[PDB]
Structure formats: C-alpha cells, structure tokens
Amino acid sequence: AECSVDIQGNDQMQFNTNAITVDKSCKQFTVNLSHPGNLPKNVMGHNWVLSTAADMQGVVTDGMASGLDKDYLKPDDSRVIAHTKLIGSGEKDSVTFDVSKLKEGEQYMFFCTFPGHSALMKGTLTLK
Amino acid sequence: AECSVDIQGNDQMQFNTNAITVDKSCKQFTVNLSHPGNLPKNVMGHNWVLSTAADMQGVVTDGMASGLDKDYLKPDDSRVIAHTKLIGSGEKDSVTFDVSKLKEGEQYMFFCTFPGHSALMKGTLTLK
Numbered sequence A, B: 001a002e003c004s005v006d007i008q009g010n011d012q013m014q015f016n017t018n019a020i021t022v023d024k025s026c027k028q029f030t031v032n033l034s035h036p037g038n039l040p041k042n043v044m045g046h047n048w049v050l051s052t053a054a055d056m057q058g059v060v061t062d063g064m065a066s067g068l069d070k071d072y073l074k075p076d077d078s079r080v081i082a083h084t085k086l087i088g089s090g091e092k093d094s095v096t097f098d099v100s101k102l103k104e105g106e107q108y109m110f111f112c113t114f115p116g117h118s119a120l121m122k123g124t125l126t127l128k
C-alpha cells in the first residue's frame, strides 16, 4: 500500500486489478504476486510484466516464443521495465523497481506473458 | 457439409464460428474439430462440448474441477449432449451425435471447457 501493491492471478485467467498508480514520491515500488487456485505453472502460470503500452505486443509475442523454460519472457528484453517470474498456484513472487525509470506523460501497461493470457490479464500502470 | 461442420479452435482462444445450425432432416450430426497453431495441449487445449444454454455453466464449473487428465469434463456428465477430446495444435477430433437428442425450440450452446476458455470460446447451436 502506497509503495507496494499485492496482486493475484487466479485459475480463471484474471488479475484481481487492472489499474495500479505509482505515487511519484515512491523512490521504489514493490509488486507481490500470488496465484490463488489449483492449476500448475505449465497449464496456468502467471507473471506480472511491465513495459510501455507501445512495447507490450512485442514483449508478449517474443515472450510466447521463449517458452516455459524462460518463464515466457525473452531473456534480458530491454523493453521490460520489471517482471516477476512465472508462478503456478500456491507459489508467490515479489519485484521491486525504481520509480525513476518511469516518466510522467508515458502510458505503461502491466500484463501476463503466459500464452493467450494478456487478452484479459493486463492493466494500466500510471505515475501520479 | 451435409450433417456436419468443421470448426477450428486457434492459439488466440478463438473458435472460427459462433453459430451452428443442424438440419432437422439429419439423423446424426458430426462436428470435426481441428486446432491450427503451434501451442501444445497443456497450454492451449480445446474441446467442443454441447449442452443446453442453461447447463453450460454447471458443465464448465465441474469440468474445470475434473482436470487435465479428465479433458476438463466431469465423467458421464448427464448434461453433456456430445463432446470431443481435448486436442492440441495439429490434432483433430470428430464427434457424431444423434439429432433426436435435440428438441426444437430449446437453446443450445457449444463451448470449450479448458479453464478460462468459455469466456471467449462459445456459440449457439440450433435445429432448423
């Protein structure tokens, strides 16, 4: 809360939120992802990946092609501002990034790169 | 085709049609399901299941619970009029069912029961 958010992705291929606001006073922001459910990583794993809206498509496509072994993310993709690893149910993960890598006036999107998920598992991240 | 239809479930969780009509003159009707794309069955499996519009959500909820190994369908689910196997990309499966199992003036829904897919993969079927 304020400089951290808890987000979850369930077995219904939905995130519990589709809008996160990062207050400009946070020096760093922390996302703690958990996966409520029963389905395993290779069938319904989720991750939380951040990029600009313009880069999202490319991240998702190259991510799909990197496979489960790469957590569906192209290794060292420079378009990815921050990301968790891919988790199956009952697993969790956390990521902290520098808010100074975000600029005011730019549209950012968070999403899951597990194949097909981004159509519903996505939302807005905004500096305010 | 006479007394048959071909439908494809792709890698974007989409069926290539949302309406099927069954000619009342057909004694039996066949659905031929294929899955274009490159994604494997555990990640993007699709089946085609038929029920009344009123039974679809109970079939989907109990199907998810039966899991992977049960092709995400409850064994001997009395509300399922007909269904294929769950198939991966490059696979094919047909189902033939008796048309006398369909009433005139009742609404039917076909859908995929792989978790999360019926939100997008579903359509109506009706006698004519």
Ligand SMILES: [Cu+2]
Pocket (backbone or CB within 6 Å): A009, A044, A045, A046, A047, A112, A113, A114, A117, A121
């Ligand atoms: Cu996901």
Ligand SMILES: [Cu+2]
Pocket (backbone or CB within 6 Å): B009, B013, B044, B045, B046, B047, B112, B113, B114, B117, B121
């Ligand atoms: Cu499906």
